[PDB]
Subunit: 159 residues, 8 copies
C-alpha cells in the first residue's frame, strides 16, 4: 500500500503529460505517489524529497519537466535510486530543450530518459514497472500480460 514509485513534476502545467505515467502505474497496480516538485522554484523540497526517497521505501522515481527541465537531473543528483526522466513538450522548442537538459547528464549521474510528451510519461511508468518486475513475480506476470495485450490488440488494417 506504501508507494514504491514516486512521480514528480515541475508544475501543474506538466500534469496533462505526467497523468499518463500515473494512469499506467494504477493500471498495473503499482503503489505510488504523485507530486509537484520544482528544482528551480522549490530546491529544498527537491533535495529533501530525493534524499529521503530510498528511506521512505521508494524504488524508482519518475520526474517530468518542461523548458530547461532541471528537475530530473537534480533529483538524480540527490538519490541513489534509479531516476527516469520525461521531457515535457513546450510551446516554443517543442520539448527539445527539455530533452537535452535531461538526457545529456554527465557521467556519474544518470537519468533514464524517455520520449518527449505523453508517450514518454507512459513509458517511464512502464520502464519503472519492468524494473520492479525483476523482484515481484505477480507484477512481472501482470506486465507480461499488459505487453501481450498491446501486441495482440494492434489492428491488422487501418479503418
Amino acid at each position: 500500500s506504501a508507494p514504491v514509485v514516486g512521480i514528480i513534476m515541475g508544475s501543474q502545467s506538466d500534469w496533462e503529460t505526467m497523468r499518463h505515467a500515473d494512469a499506467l502505474l494504477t493500471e498495473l497496480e503499482i503503489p505510488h505517489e504523485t507530486l509537484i516538485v520544482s528544482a528551480n522554484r522549490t530546491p529544498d523540497r527537491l533535495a529533501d524529497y530525493a534524499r529521503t526517497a530510498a528511506e521512505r521505501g521508494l524504488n524508482v522515481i519518475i520526474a517530468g519537466a518542461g523548458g530547461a527541465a532541471h528537475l530530473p537531473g537534480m533529483c538524480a543528483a540527490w538519490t541513489r535510486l534509479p531516476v527516469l526522466g520525461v521531457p515535457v513538450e513546450s510551446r516554443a522548442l517543442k520539448g527539445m530543450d527539455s530533452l537535452l537538459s535531461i538526457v545529456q547528464m554527465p557521467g556519474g549521474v544518470p537519468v533514464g530518459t524517455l520520449a518527449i510528451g505523453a508517450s514518454g510519461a507512459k513509458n517511464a511508468a512502464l520502464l519503472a514497472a519492468s524494473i520492479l518486475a525483476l523482484y515481484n513475480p505477480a507484477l512481472a506476470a501482470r506486465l507480461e500480460t499488459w505487453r501481450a495485450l498491446q501486441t495482440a490488440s494492434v489492428p491488422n488494417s487501418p479503418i
Copy 2:
C-alpha cells in the same frame, strides 16, 4: 558468475563508446556479457538474443547504437526486461540521429536513454547498477561508495596551466 546485465552494440565501431559501460560494471563487480548485435544488419540474431534474455537470467540490457539506431528499441520490443539505450555519436549529425532514433520510442515500448557518447555508456551501466542495487545490498553499498567518492573527488578550485 552468471551475467545479469547484457551489453549489446551494433558494431565494433560502437565499442570505443560501449567499453565504458563494460568497465563500470566490472568495477562494480556486476557479472555481465558483452556482444555485438545489429538490429538492421542481424535482425534474427537480435530477435534470438532479446527473446531469450529473461530466461538466460539477464535482468538489464544496455544497448548502444548510432545513426538510424534501432537496436535498443527492437531489443525492447522482444523483452520485458528494462532496456537502456546509449546513442553512439555519429560523424555528420554528431549523434542527433542516434538520440532521436532511440529516445522517441512509441508509448508501450520503453527504452531508458542516456547521453550521447561515452558519458551515456557510463551512465547506462550506473543506471543498471542502481536497478540491480534495489535487491542487492552488497552492490548497493558498493554503488553508494562509488557515488560518494565521485562527489568528494571533485576539485574545489581550478588549476591554471
Copy 3:
C-alpha cells in the same frame, strides 16, 4: 489482382498520412495491400510480413511511421525487396525524428526515403509505380499520363 505493393504503417494514427499512398496506387490501378504493422509493438508480425513479402508476390513495400519510426528500416532488414519510407509528421518534432531514423540507415540496408507527411506518402506510391513501370508497359504509359497531367495542370497564375 494480387497485390504487388504493400503499404504498411506503424499505427492507425498514420492512416491520415498513408492514405495518400493508398489513393495514388488505386488511381494508377496498381494492386496492393494496406496494413498496420508496428516494428516495436508487433515485431514478429513485421518479421513474418517482411520475410514472406517476395514469396507472396510483392515487389515494393511502402512503410510509414512517426516518432523513432523503426518500421521502415526493420522491414528492409528482413526483405530483399525495395523498401520506401515515409516519415510521419508528429506533434513534438514535426517528423524530424522520423526522418533521421529512416533515412540514416547504415550501408547495406537501404530505405528510399520520401518527404515528411502526405506528400512523402504520395511520392512513395509514385516512386513504387515508377519502379513497377520498368517492366509493365501499360502501367508505364499510365504513369507517363499521370506525370503529364500534373505538369499540364499547374496554373499559370495564382487566383
Copy 4:
C-alpha cells in the same frame, strides 16, 4: 554492356562519396555510367541527360549532391524513371542542407533519398540493385548472396584494442 543505372553527381568533390555507389554496382555486375552534372551550374546538361535517360536504356538514376542540392529533384522532374538521391555531406551544415534539399520533394515528383555520405551512396546502389533484381533472376541471386554475406560477416563480440 549497355548501362542500366546512371550515376550522376554535381561535382568532382562529390566523387569521394559517389564512388561508393559506383563500386557497389560494379561488384554486383550492374552495367552503369558515371557522370558529373550540376543542376545549378549545368542545367541544360541536366535537362538533356534526364530527358533522354529512358530512351537511352537507363532504368534507375542515382544522383548525388550537396548544399542546395537540386540535382536529384530536377533530374526527377524530367524523367519518369525512379531517381534515388544521395545527400553529400557539406562543410558547415554537415549535410543537413543537402538532406532537406533532396528529401523534401513536393508531392508528384519523387526522389528516394538515402543517408548522408558514403553510406547513402552505397545504399543508393543497393536500392537500385533491388529494383533491377525484381526482373533479373541472376542479379537477384547475386544480391541475395551479397546481403547474406553481410549478415554472416558481422562479428559476435568486440575486439578490445
Copy 5:
C-alpha cells in the same frame, strides 16, 4: 507598363505568402507580373521563363517556394538577372528546409535570400525596388518616402 519584375511561385499554396510581394510592388507602382512556376512540376516552363526573362525586359525576379524549394535556385541557374528568393513556411519544418535549399546556393549561382514567410516576400519586393531605384529617380524618391513613412510610423509606446 511592361513588367520589370517577375514574381514566380511554386504553387497556389504559396500565394498567401507571395501576395505581400505583389502588394508591395503595386504600392510602389513597379510594373510586374505574378505567375505560378514549379521547378519540379513544370521544369520546361521554368527554363523558358528564366531564359527569356532579360529579353522580355524583366530586371529582377522574385521567386518563392516551400519544401525543398528548388524554384529560386533553378531560376537563377537559367537567367543572368538578379534572383531574389523567399522561403515559404511549411507545415512540418516551418520553412527551414526551404531556407537552406535557397540560401545555400553554390558559388557562381546566387539567390539573394529573404526571411521565411510574408515578411520575406514583402522584403523581396522592397529589395527589388531598391535595385530598380538605382536607375529610376522617380522610383528612388517613392522608395525613400516609403522607408521614411515606415520609420516615422512606428509608435513610441505599446497599446
Copy 6:
C-alpha cells in the same frame, strides 16, 4: 575609379571569407572599397558609413558578419541601397547563428542573404554584379562571359585518384 560597391565586414577574422567577394569584383572590373565595420562594436562608425553610402556614389553594399550578425541589417536600416549579407561561419554553431541573425530581417528592412562562408561571399559579389549589369552593358557582357565559362568548365566525368 570611384567605388560603386562597398564591402564591409565585422572584423579581420571575417576577411578570410570576404576576400572572395573582393576578388570576384576585381575580376569583373567593378570599382569597390573594402572596410572593416562592426555593428555591435563600432555602431557609430556603421551609422556614418551607411548614411553616407548613397551620397558617396555606392550602389550596392556587401556586408559580412558572424555570430549575432547585425552588420548587414543595421547597414540596411540606414541606407536605401540594396544590402547583401554574407553569413560568416561561426566556430560552435557553424554559421547557423550568423545565417538566422542576417536573413530573418523584419518586413520593411531587406537584406539579400547568401550562403554561409566563402561561397556566400563570392555570390554576394556576383549578385551585386548582376545588379550593376542591369545598367552597364560592358559589365553585363563580362558577367555573361564569366557565367558561360563557369558552365563550360564543369567536367563531364569524375577523376578517380
Copy 7:
C-alpha cells in the same frame, strides 16, 4: 517616480510577451518606462535612446524582439548600462532565430539573455530587480518576499 528601468520592444507585436516584464516591475514597485523601439526600422531612435539611457537615470534596460532581433544587441552597443534580452517567439522558427541573434553577442558587448517568450520577459524584470536590489534595501526585501511567495505557493500535488 522617475524610471530606473527601460523596457523596449521591437514592435506592438511583442507587447503580448513584453507585458509580463511590465507587470512584474509594477508589482515590485520599480519605476520604469515601456516603449516601442526598432533597431532596423527606427535606428536613430534606438541610438538616441541607448546613448542617453544612463543620463536619464536608467539603470537597466530590458529589450525584447522577434525574428533576427537586432534590438537587444544594438542597444547594448550604445549604452554602458546592463542590457537584458528577451527572445520573442515567432511563427516560423519559434524564437530560435531571436535567441541566437541575442545570446551570441561578441566579447565586449554583452546582453544577459533570458528564455524565449513570456517567461523570459518575466525573468528579465526579475533579473533587473535583483540588480537594483543590490543597492536598494526596501526593494531587496520586497524581492525576497516575492521569491519566498513563489517557492511557498507551489502546490504539493497536481489537481
Copy 8:
C-alpha cells in the same frame, strides 16, 4: 579585497572557458573568487555556496557549465543575487545542450545567459562589471575606458596575408 563577484564552474574542463571571465574581472580590478562547483555532482556544495553568497558579500555570480548545464539555474534557485550563466561548448552538440539547459529557465528564476564559449565568459564578466558600475563610480570610469578603447581599437581595413 573582499570578493563581490563569484565565478563558479562545473569542472576543471570548464576553466579553459571561464578563465576569460576571471581575467576580465581582474583587469577591471573587481575583487572576486573562482571555484569549481557541480550542480549534478556536488549538489550540497552548490546549495551551501548559493545560500550563503549574499551574506558573504557577493553581489553577482557568474556560473559556467556544459552539457545538461544545471549549475547556473540551481544557483539562482538558492540566491536572490543576479546569476549570469555561461554555456560551455560541448563536444557533440557544440554547446546547444549547454545553452538551452541554461537559458530556458522557468518564469520566476532568472539566469542572464551569455554566448557559448569564451566570448560568453568574457561578456559575463563585463555584464557583472556594468552591474557593479551602477553604484561604483571608479569602476564605471574604468568600464567606460575599457569599452571606449575596444571601439577605437577596431581596424578600419582588412590585412591581406
